[PDB]
Amino acid sequence: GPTSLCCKQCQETEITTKNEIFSLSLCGPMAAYVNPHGYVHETLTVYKASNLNLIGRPSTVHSWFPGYAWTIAQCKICASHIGWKFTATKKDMSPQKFWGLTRSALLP
Ligand SMILES: [Zn+2]
């Protein structure tokens, strides 16, 4: 479908849709400055994703989104690294999980 964002390598496999896109605030209370940590502009954040295999267990090491652990996520079909699943370290956070997907790894 027109909303469909698929793995660029295998083409057929849908990873997320444009419907699931949202904007995560990279700042904390009062919207203070933060040093950029990783490369967020290149990363698309979505609430829900599909057809990915999670590799290993959640890690907090040098997380691009502080407060969240990350787990590598690769296409079930072709094993291309599309991005990461992010899971909250604290119960009071929202969303408790989301996906950060490398834009260049998707089509469109
Ligand atoms: Zn693929």
What features would you describe in this structure?
- Zn(2+) binds at residues 7, 10, 75, 78.
- It is found in: Cytoplasm; Nucleus; Membrane.
- Component of a DCX (DDB1-CUL4-X-box) protein ligase complex, at least composed of CRBN, CUL4A, DDB1 and RBX1. Interacts directly with DDB1. Interacts with KCNT1. Interacts with ILF2. Interacts with TRAF6 and ECSIT.
- GO terms for molecular function: metal ion binding; transmembrane transporter binding.
- The chain is mainly beta.
- The chain has a single domain, classed as Metal Binding Protein, Guanine Nucleotide Exchange Factor, Chain A.
- Helices cover 0% and strands 41% of the residues.
- It contains no helices and 8 strands.
- Strands 3-7-6-5-4 form a 5-stranded antiparallel sheet, with no helix packed on it.
- Strand 5 (68-75) and strand 6 (81-88) form a beta hairpin.
- The site of zinc ion (ZN) has 8 residues, from loops.
- Zinc ion (ZN) is lined by residues 7, 9-10, 13, 75, 77-78, 80.
Order of helices and strands: EEEEEEEE
How many helices? The count is 0
Strand fraction band?
35-45%
Helix fraction bin? under 10%
The Cα radius of gyration reads 14 Å
Biggest sheet, strands in spatial order?
3-7-6-5-4
Specify the biggest β-sheet: 5 strands, antiparallel
CATH-assigned fold name = Metal Binding Protein, Guanine Nucleotide Exchange Factor, Chain A
Question: What is the CATH H-level superfamily?
Answer: Peptide methionine sulfoxide reductase
End-to-end Cα distance, whole Å, is 11 Å
Q: Could you give the count of β-strands?
A: 8
Mind telling me the CATH class?
Answer: Mainly Beta
When the domains are counted, the total is 1
Name every ligand kind in the structure: zinc ion
Helix/strand-derived category reads mainly beta
> Outline, from the CA principal axes?
globular
CATH architectural grouping: Beta Complex
PDB class: metal binding protein
Keywords: Zinc Finger, E3 ubiquitin ligase, metal binding protein
Assembly: monomeric
Entry title: Mouse Cereblon thalidomide binding domain, native
